[PDB]
Coordinates of C-alpha atoms and ligand atoms in Angstrom, one line a residue:
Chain A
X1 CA 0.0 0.0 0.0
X2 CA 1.5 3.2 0.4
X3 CA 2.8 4.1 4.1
X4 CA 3.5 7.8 5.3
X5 CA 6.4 8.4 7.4
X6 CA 5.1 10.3 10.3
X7 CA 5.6 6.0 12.2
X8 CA 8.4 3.8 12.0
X9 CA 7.5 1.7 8.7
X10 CA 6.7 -1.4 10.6
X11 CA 5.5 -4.7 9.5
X12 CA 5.0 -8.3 9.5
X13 CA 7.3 -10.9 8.1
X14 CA 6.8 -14.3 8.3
X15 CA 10.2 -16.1 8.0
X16 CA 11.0 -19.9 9.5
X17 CA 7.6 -20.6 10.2
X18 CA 7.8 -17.8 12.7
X19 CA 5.5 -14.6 12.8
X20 CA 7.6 -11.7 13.5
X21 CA 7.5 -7.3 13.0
X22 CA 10.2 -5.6 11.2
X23 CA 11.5 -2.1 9.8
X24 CA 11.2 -1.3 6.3
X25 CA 14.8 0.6 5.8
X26 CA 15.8 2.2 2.4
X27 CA 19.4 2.9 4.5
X28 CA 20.1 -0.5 4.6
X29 CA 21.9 -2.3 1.3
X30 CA 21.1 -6.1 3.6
X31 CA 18.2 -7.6 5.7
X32 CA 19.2 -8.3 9.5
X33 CA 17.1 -9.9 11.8
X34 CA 17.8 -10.6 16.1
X35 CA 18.7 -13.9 17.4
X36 CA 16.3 -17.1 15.9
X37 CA 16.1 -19.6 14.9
X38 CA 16.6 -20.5 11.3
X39 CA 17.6 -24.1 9.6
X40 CA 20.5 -24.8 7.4
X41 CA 24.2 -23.5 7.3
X42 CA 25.8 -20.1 7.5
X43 CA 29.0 -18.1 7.3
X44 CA 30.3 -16.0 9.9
X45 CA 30.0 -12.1 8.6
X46 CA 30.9 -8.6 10.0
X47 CA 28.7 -5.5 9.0
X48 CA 29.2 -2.1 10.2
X49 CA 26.1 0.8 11.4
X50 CA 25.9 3.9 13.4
X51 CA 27.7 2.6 16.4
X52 CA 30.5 0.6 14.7
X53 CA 30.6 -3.6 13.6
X54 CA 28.5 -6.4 14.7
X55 CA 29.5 -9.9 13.7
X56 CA 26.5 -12.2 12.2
X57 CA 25.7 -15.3 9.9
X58 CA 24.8 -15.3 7.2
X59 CA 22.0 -17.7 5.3
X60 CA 21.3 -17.3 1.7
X61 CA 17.9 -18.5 -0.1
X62 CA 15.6 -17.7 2.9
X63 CA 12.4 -17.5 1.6
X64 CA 10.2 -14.5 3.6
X65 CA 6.7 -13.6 3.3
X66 CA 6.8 -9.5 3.9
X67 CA 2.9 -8.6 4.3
X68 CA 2.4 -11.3 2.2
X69 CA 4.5 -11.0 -0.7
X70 CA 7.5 -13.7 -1.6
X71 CA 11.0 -13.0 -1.8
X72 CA 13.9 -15.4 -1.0
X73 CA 17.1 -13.7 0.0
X74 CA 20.2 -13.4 1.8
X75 CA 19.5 -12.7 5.9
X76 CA 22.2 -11.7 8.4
X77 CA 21.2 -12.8 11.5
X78 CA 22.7 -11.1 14.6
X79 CA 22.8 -8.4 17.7
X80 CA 20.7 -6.1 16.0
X81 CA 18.5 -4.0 18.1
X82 CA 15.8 -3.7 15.4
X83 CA 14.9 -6.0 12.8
X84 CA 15.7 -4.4 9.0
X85 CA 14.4 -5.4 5.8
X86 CA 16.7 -3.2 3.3
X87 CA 17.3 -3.5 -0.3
X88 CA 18.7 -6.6 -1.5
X89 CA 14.7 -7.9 -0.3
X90 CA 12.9 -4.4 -1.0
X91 CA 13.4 -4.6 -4.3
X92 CA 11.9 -8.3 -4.9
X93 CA 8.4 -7.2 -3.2
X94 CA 8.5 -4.0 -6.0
X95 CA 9.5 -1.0 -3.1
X96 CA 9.8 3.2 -4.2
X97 CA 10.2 6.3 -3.1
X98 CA 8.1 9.0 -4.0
X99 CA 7.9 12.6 -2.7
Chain B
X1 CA 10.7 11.6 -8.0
X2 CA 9.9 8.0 -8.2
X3 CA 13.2 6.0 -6.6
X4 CA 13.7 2.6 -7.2
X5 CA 15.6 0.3 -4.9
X6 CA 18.4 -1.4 -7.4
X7 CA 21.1 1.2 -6.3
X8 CA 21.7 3.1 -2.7
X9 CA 18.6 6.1 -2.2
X10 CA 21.4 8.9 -2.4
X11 CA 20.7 12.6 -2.6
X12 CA 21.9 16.1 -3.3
X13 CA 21.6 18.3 0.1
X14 CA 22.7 22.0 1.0
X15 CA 23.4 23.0 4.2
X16 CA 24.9 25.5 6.0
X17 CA 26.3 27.1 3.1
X18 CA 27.5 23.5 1.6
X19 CA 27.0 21.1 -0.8
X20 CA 27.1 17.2 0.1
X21 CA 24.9 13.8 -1.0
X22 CA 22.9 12.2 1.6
X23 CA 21.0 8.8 1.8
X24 CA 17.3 8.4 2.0
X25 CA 16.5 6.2 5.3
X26 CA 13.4 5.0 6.5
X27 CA 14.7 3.6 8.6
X28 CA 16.0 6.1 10.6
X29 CA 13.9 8.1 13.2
X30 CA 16.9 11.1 13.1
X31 CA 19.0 12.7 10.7
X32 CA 22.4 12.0 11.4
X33 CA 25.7 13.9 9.2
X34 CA 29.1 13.8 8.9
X35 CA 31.4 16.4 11.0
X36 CA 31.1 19.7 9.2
X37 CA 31.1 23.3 10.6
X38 CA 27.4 24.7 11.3
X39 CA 26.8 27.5 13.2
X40 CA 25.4 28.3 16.2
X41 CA 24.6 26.4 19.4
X42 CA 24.0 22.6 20.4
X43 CA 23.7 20.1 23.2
X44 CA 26.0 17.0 23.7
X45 CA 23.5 14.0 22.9
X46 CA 24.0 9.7 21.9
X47 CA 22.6 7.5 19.5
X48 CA 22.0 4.0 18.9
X49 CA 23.0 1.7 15.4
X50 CA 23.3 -1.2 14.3
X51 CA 27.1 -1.3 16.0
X52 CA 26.5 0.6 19.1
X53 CA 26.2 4.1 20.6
X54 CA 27.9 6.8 19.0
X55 CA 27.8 10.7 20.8
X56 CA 26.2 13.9 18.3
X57 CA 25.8 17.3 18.4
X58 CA 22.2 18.3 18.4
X59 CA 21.5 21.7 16.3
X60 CA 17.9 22.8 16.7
X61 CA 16.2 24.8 13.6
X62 CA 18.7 23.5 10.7
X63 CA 17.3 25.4 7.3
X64 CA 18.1 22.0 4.4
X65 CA 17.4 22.1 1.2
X66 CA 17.0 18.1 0.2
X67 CA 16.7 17.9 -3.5
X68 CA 15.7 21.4 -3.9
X69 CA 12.8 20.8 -1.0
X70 CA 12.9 23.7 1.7
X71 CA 12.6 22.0 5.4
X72 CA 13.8 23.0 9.3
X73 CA 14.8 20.5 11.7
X74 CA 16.8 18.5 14.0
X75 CA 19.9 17.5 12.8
X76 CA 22.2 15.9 14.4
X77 CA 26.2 15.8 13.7
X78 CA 28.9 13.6 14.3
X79 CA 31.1 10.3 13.6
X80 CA 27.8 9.0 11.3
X81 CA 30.0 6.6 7.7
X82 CA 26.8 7.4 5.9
X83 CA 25.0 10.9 5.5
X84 CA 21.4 10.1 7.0
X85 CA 18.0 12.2 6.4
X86 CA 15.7 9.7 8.6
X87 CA 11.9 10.8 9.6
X88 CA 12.0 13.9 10.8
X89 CA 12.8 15.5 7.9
X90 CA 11.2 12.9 5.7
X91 CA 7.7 14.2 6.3
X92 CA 8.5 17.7 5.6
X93 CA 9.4 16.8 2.3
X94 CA 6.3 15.1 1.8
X95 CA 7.9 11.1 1.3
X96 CA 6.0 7.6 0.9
X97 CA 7.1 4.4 0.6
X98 CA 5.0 1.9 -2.1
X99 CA 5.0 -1.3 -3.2
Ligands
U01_1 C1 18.5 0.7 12.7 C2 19.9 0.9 12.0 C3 20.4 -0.4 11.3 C4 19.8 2.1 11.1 C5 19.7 3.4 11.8 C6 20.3 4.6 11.3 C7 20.2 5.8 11.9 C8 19.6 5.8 13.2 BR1 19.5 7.6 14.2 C9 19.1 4.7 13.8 C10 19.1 3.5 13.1 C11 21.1 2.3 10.2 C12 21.1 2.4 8.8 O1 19.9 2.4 8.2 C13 22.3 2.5 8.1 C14 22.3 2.6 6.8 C15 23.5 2.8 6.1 C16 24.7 2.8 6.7 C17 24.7 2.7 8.1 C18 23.5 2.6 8.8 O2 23.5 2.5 10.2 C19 22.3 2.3 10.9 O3 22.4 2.1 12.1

Protein backbone atom coordinates (compact mmCIF):
# COMPACT_ATOMS: atom_id res chain seq x y z
CA UNK A 1 0.00 0.00 0.00
CA UNK A 2 1.50 3.22 0.36
CA UNK A 3 2.81 4.07 4.05
CA UNK A 4 3.50 7.83 5.34
CA UNK A 5 6.40 8.38 7.39
CA UNK A 6 5.12 10.30 10.28
CA UNK A 7 5.57 5.98 12.21
CA UNK A 8 8.43 3.76 11.95
CA UNK A 9 7.50 1.68 8.75
CA UNK A 10 6.75 -1.38 10.60
CA UNK A 11 5.50 -4.74 9.52
CA UNK A 12 4.99 -8.32 9.47
CA UNK A 13 7.27 -10.88 8.11
CA UNK A 14 6.83 -14.35 8.33
CA UNK A 15 10.18 -16.08 8.05
CA UNK A 16 10.95 -19.90 9.46
CA UNK A 17 7.63 -20.64 10.22
CA UNK A 18 7.76 -17.81 12.66
CA UNK A 19 5.49 -14.61 12.83
CA UNK A 20 7.61 -11.67 13.46
CA UNK A 21 7.48 -7.34 12.99
CA UNK A 22 10.21 -5.63 11.16
CA UNK A 23 11.48 -2.09 9.82
CA UNK A 24 11.22 -1.27 6.29
CA UNK A 25 14.85 0.58 5.84
CA UNK A 26 15.81 2.18 2.35
CA UNK A 27 19.36 2.88 4.51
CA UNK A 28 20.12 -0.48 4.61
CA UNK A 29 21.94 -2.26 1.35
CA UNK A 30 21.15 -6.12 3.62
CA UNK A 31 18.22 -7.58 5.72
CA UNK A 32 19.20 -8.33 9.54
CA UNK A 33 17.05 -9.86 11.78
CA UNK A 34 17.77 -10.57 16.07
CA UNK A 35 18.74 -13.93 17.44
CA UNK A 36 16.27 -17.08 15.91
CA UNK A 37 16.08 -19.55 14.89
CA UNK A 38 16.62 -20.47 11.33
CA UNK A 39 17.60 -24.11 9.61
CA UNK A 40 20.54 -24.79 7.41
CA UNK A 41 24.23 -23.53 7.34
CA UNK A 42 25.79 -20.11 7.50
CA UNK A 43 29.00 -18.13 7.28
CA UNK A 44 30.29 -15.99 9.95
CA UNK A 45 30.04 -12.09 8.60
CA UNK A 46 30.87 -8.56 10.00
CA UNK A 47 28.67 -5.46 8.97
CA UNK A 48 29.19 -2.10 10.22
CA UNK A 49 26.14 0.84 11.45
CA UNK A 50 25.87 3.95 13.36
CA UNK A 51 27.67 2.65 16.41
CA UNK A 52 30.47 0.57 14.68
CA UNK A 53 30.63 -3.57 13.56
CA UNK A 54 28.52 -6.42 14.68
CA UNK A 55 29.50 -9.92 13.70
CA UNK A 56 26.46 -12.21 12.25
CA UNK A 57 25.72 -15.29 9.93
CA UNK A 58 24.77 -15.34 7.20
CA UNK A 59 22.03 -17.66 5.32
CA UNK A 60 21.27 -17.30 1.68
CA UNK A 61 17.90 -18.55 -0.08
CA UNK A 62 15.63 -17.72 2.89
CA UNK A 63 12.39 -17.50 1.63
CA UNK A 64 10.18 -14.51 3.60
CA UNK A 65 6.66 -13.62 3.32
CA UNK A 66 6.80 -9.55 3.91
CA UNK A 67 2.91 -8.56 4.25
CA UNK A 68 2.44 -11.26 2.18
CA UNK A 69 4.48 -10.98 -0.74
CA UNK A 70 7.48 -13.68 -1.56
CA UNK A 71 10.99 -13.01 -1.76
CA UNK A 72 13.85 -15.36 -1.04
CA UNK A 73 17.11 -13.72 0.00
CA UNK A 74 20.22 -13.41 1.78
CA UNK A 75 19.51 -12.73 5.92
CA UNK A 76 22.16 -11.73 8.42
CA UNK A 77 21.19 -12.76 11.54
CA UNK A 78 22.66 -11.14 14.63
CA UNK A 79 22.85 -8.40 17.70
CA UNK A 80 20.69 -6.05 15.99
CA UNK A 81 18.53 -3.96 18.14
CA UNK A 82 15.83 -3.69 15.41
CA UNK A 83 14.93 -6.04 12.82
CA UNK A 84 15.69 -4.40 9.04
CA UNK A 85 14.44 -5.35 5.80
CA UNK A 86 16.71 -3.21 3.34
CA UNK A 87 17.34 -3.50 -0.26
CA UNK A 88 18.66 -6.55 -1.51
CA UNK A 89 14.73 -7.89 -0.29
CA UNK A 90 12.94 -4.37 -1.00
CA UNK A 91 13.41 -4.64 -4.32
CA UNK A 92 11.88 -8.29 -4.87
CA UNK A 93 8.37 -7.23 -3.16
CA UNK A 94 8.54 -4.00 -5.98
CA UNK A 95 9.46 -0.96 -3.11
CA UNK A 96 9.85 3.20 -4.20
CA UNK A 97 10.22 6.33 -3.07
CA UNK A 98 8.09 9.00 -4.02
CA UNK A 99 7.91 12.59 -2.69
CA UNK B 1 10.72 11.65 -8.01
CA UNK B 2 9.95 8.05 -8.22
CA UNK B 3 13.18 6.02 -6.60
CA UNK B 4 13.69 2.56 -7.25
CA UNK B 5 15.57 0.26 -4.92
CA UNK B 6 18.42 -1.44 -7.42
CA UNK B 7 21.08 1.16 -6.28
CA UNK B 8 21.72 3.13 -2.74
CA UNK B 9 18.65 6.12 -2.17
CA UNK B 10 21.40 8.91 -2.44
CA UNK B 11 20.71 12.62 -2.56
CA UNK B 12 21.91 16.13 -3.31
CA UNK B 13 21.56 18.25 0.06
CA UNK B 14 22.66 22.04 1.00
CA UNK B 15 23.35 22.99 4.23
CA UNK B 16 24.95 25.46 6.04
CA UNK B 17 26.32 27.06 3.08
CA UNK B 18 27.49 23.55 1.57
CA UNK B 19 27.01 21.08 -0.80
CA UNK B 20 27.07 17.16 0.07
CA UNK B 21 24.94 13.77 -1.04
CA UNK B 22 22.93 12.19 1.64
CA UNK B 23 20.97 8.77 1.85
CA UNK B 24 17.26 8.44 2.03
CA UNK B 25 16.50 6.18 5.31
CA UNK B 26 13.39 5.02 6.50
CA UNK B 27 14.66 3.63 8.61
CA UNK B 28 16.02 6.14 10.60
CA UNK B 29 13.94 8.10 13.21
CA UNK B 30 16.89 11.07 13.14
CA UNK B 31 19.05 12.70 10.70
CA UNK B 32 22.37 12.01 11.45
CA UNK B 33 25.74 13.95 9.21
CA UNK B 34 29.14 13.77 8.91
CA UNK B 35 31.37 16.38 11.02
CA UNK B 36 31.06 19.67 9.23
CA UNK B 37 31.13 23.26 10.60
CA UNK B 38 27.44 24.70 11.32
CA UNK B 39 26.79 27.55 13.15
CA UNK B 40 25.45 28.26 16.18
CA UNK B 41 24.60 26.43 19.43
CA UNK B 42 24.05 22.61 20.36
CA UNK B 43 23.73 20.13 23.19
CA UNK B 44 25.96 16.98 23.69
CA UNK B 45 23.48 13.96 22.90
CA UNK B 46 24.04 9.75 21.95
CA UNK B 47 22.56 7.47 19.55
CA UNK B 48 21.98 3.97 18.95
CA UNK B 49 22.96 1.74 15.36
CA UNK B 50 23.34 -1.17 14.26
CA UNK B 51 27.05 -1.25 16.03
CA UNK B 52 26.45 0.57 19.11
CA UNK B 53 26.15 4.10 20.57
CA UNK B 54 27.87 6.80 18.96
CA UNK B 55 27.80 10.67 20.84
CA UNK B 56 26.20 13.85 18.32
CA UNK B 57 25.85 17.34 18.40
CA UNK B 58 22.24 18.30 18.35
CA UNK B 59 21.53 21.73 16.28
CA UNK B 60 17.93 22.77 16.67
CA UNK B 61 16.17 24.79 13.56
CA UNK B 62 18.70 23.49 10.70
CA UNK B 63 17.34 25.41 7.26
CA UNK B 64 18.08 22.05 4.35
CA UNK B 65 17.36 22.10 1.19
CA UNK B 66 17.02 18.07 0.19
CA UNK B 67 16.66 17.94 -3.49
CA UNK B 68 15.70 21.40 -3.95
CA UNK B 69 12.79 20.85 -1.00
CA UNK B 70 12.91 23.73 1.72
CA UNK B 71 12.64 22.00 5.44
CA UNK B 72 13.85 22.96 9.31
CA UNK B 73 14.77 20.47 11.70
CA UNK B 74 16.80 18.51 14.04
CA UNK B 75 19.94 17.55 12.81
CA UNK B 76 22.24 15.91 14.44
CA UNK B 77 26.24 15.84 13.69
CA UNK B 78 28.91 13.58 14.32
CA UNK B 79 31.09 10.30 13.60
CA UNK B 80 27.83 8.95 11.28
CA UNK B 81 29.97 6.61 7.71
CA UNK B 82 26.85 7.43 5.94
CA UNK B 83 25.00 10.95 5.53
CA UNK B 84 21.36 10.08 6.97
CA UNK B 85 18.00 12.21 6.43
CA UNK B 86 15.66 9.72 8.57
CA UNK B 87 11.86 10.85 9.61
CA UNK B 88 11.95 13.94 10.80
CA UNK B 89 12.84 15.54 7.89
CA UNK B 90 11.19 12.89 5.70
CA UNK B 91 7.74 14.16 6.33
CA UNK B 92 8.52 17.66 5.61
CA UNK B 93 9.39 16.75 2.25
CA UNK B 94 6.33 15.06 1.81
CA UNK B 95 7.86 11.09 1.29
CA UNK B 96 6.03 7.65 0.91
CA UNK B 97 7.14 4.36 0.65
CA UNK B 98 5.03 1.89 -2.07
CA UNK B 99 4.97 -1.27 -3.25
C1 LIG C 1 18.52 0.68 12.68
C2 LIG C 1 19.88 0.87 12.00
C3 LIG C 1 20.37 -0.40 11.29
C4 LIG C 1 19.84 2.09 11.06
C5 LIG C 1 19.73 3.40 11.84
C6 LIG C 1 20.26 4.55 11.27
C7 LIG C 1 20.20 5.77 11.94
C8 LIG C 1 19.60 5.83 13.20
BR1 LIG C 1 19.50 7.59 14.15
C9 LIG C 1 19.07 4.68 13.77
C10 LIG C 1 19.14 3.46 13.09
C11 LIG C 1 21.11 2.25 10.23
C12 LIG C 1 21.08 2.37 8.85
O1 LIG C 1 19.88 2.41 8.19
C13 LIG C 1 22.28 2.52 8.14
C14 LIG C 1 22.29 2.64 6.76
C15 LIG C 1 23.49 2.79 6.07
C16 LIG C 1 24.70 2.81 6.74
C17 LIG C 1 24.70 2.72 8.13
C18 LIG C 1 23.50 2.57 8.81
O2 LIG C 1 23.52 2.47 10.19
C19 LIG C 1 22.33 2.31 10.90
O3 LIG C 1 22.36 2.11 12.12
Amino acid sequence: PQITLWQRPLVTIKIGGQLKEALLDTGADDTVLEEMSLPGRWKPKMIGGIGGFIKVRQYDQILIEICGHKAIGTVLVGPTPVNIIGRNLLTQIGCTLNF
